[PDB]
Amino acid sequence: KQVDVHDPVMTREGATWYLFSTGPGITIYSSKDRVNWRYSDRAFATEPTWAKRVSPSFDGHLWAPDIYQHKGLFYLYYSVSAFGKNTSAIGVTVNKTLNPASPDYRWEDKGIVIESVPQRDLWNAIAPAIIADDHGQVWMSFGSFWGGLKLFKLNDDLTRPAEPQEWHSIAKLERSVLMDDSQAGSAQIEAPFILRKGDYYYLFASWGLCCRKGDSTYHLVVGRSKQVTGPYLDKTGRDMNQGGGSLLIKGNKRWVGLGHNSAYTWDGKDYLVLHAYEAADNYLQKLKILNLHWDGEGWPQVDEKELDSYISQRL
Numbered sequence: 001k002q003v004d005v006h007d008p009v010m011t012r013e014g015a016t017w018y019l020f021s022t023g024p025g026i027t028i029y030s031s032k033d034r035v036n037w038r039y040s041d042r043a044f045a046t047e048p049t050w051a052k053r054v055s056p057s058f059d060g061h062l063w064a065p066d067i068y069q070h071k072g073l074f075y076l077y078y079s080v081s082a083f084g085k086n087t088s089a090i091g092v093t094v095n096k097t098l099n100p101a102s103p104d105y106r107w108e109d110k111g112i113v114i115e116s117v118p119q120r121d122l123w124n125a126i127a128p129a130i131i132a133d134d135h136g137q138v139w140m141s142f143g144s145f146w147g148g149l150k151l152f153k154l155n156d157d158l159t160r161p162a163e164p165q166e167w168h169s170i171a172k173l174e175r176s177v178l179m180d181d182s183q184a185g186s187a188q189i190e191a192p193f194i195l196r197k198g199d200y201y202y203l204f205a206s207w208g209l210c211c212r213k214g215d216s217t218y219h220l221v222v223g224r225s226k227q228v229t230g231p232y233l234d235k236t237g238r239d240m241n242q243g244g245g246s247l248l249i250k251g252n253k254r255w256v257g258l259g260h261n262s263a264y265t266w267d268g269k270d271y272l273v274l275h276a277y278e279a280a281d282n283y284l285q286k287l288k289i290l291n292l293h294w295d296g297e298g299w300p301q302v303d304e305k306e307l308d309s310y311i312s313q314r315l
């Protein structure tokens with residue numbers, strides 16, 4: 001069987017790869033070769049102590065983790081939320097190592113980085129991604145529906161927004177403020193991820209509807225910017241803040257919907273990491289890791305056939 005993950009991220013410590021997925025307390029897997037994966041741990045034994053306060057319907061599944069390494073520590077960001085609501089918060093928990101067999105291994109929760117509130121905020125605090133600029137600063141991008149995707153400066157700790165705060169919109173789709181603020185609306189965009197490559201920051205995002213089986217329209221788009229704070233332009237030069245986004249990979253008949261990607265530079269090669277819904281296996285999402293190439297114009301390209309050729313093993 002293939003490894004099932006949603007909203008995947010990855011990192012490497014020493015000789016081992018680690019995969020983090022949406023799931024109870026955040027599911028972690030490990031591999032020595034990115035193909036064959038054993039269950040490693042759940043970040044939280046049960047759930048964050050503060051979870052049910054932000055979202056009372058909470059079922060134990062954290063969403064859309066991001067893994068970040070900084071001054072020798074492991075920072076695991078994660079999302080508490082409810083379906084179709086922006087009663088949400090992103091928290092972070094920190095570990096000295098990922099090897100659960102080490103006496104140094106244990107996740108310590110740092111609490112809420114940011115929280116969205118219905119009627120107050122036109123954004124949904126889920127789906128964090130961490131990126132550093134050329135000037136020592138670290139930023140979180142996040143978001144889903146509502147008024148789209150945001151970027152803000154983190155403080156020294158990486159646990160809360162820097163003060164005074166510094167925010168930038170980075171991608172959006174149409175929405176009138178006259179809509180009820182508690183509704184997700186029709187801006188089908190989520191799940192930012194920023195990769196630095198050469199002189200550019202590349203913003204990946206997911207458009208369309210995930211989690212809908214045969215009706216899913218989820219696919220990936222991309223834009224690029226010389227500065228981390230934007231504006232991110234697609235290939236036709238259109239700002240993602242006004243709905244720009246160049247198609248990177250979309251589904252077909254075997255893979256109905258794919259996305260919430262991450263992306264990495266390991267050993268002078270680049271990889272695209274995402275989930276895709278298998279039409280043959282009940283539209284159950286599967287891990288896929290694709291080779292991420294770059295054309296002569298500075299734009300990433302992927303080979304959609306790799307949705308088939310990449311076959312991960314759950315051991």
Ligand SMILES: OC[C@@H]1O[C@@H](OC[C@@H]2O[C@@H](OC[C@@H]3O[C@@H](OC[C@@H]4O[C@@H](OC[C@@H]5O[C@@H](OC[C@@H]6O[C@@H](O)[C@H](O)[C@H]6O)[C@H](O)[C@H]5O)[C@H](O)[C@H]4O)[C@H](O)[C@H]3O)[C@H](O)[C@H]2O)[C@H](O)[C@H]1O
Pocket residue numbers: 004005006007021022023024061063064081082083084085124126127144145184185190210211285
């Ligand atoms: O493989 C590993 C396992 O899979 C996971 O199980 C799958 C699912 O993933 C987890 O959640 C995924 C997150 O959900 C996606 O959707 C984001 C949501 O969409 C946006 O809202 C859209 C809006 O919602 C719908 O209407 C909502 C109605 O209003 C509510 O109040 C009412 O309850 C709803 O009926 C409409 O379609 C649309 O208008 C929001 O921004 C957001 O809520 C995100 O992309 C993912 O991050 C979840 O656990 C499973 O459902 C397992 O977790 C893992 O083990």
Ligand SMILES: [Cl-]
Pocket residue numbers: 007064065066127128129191192193260261262
């Ligand atoms: Cl993500």
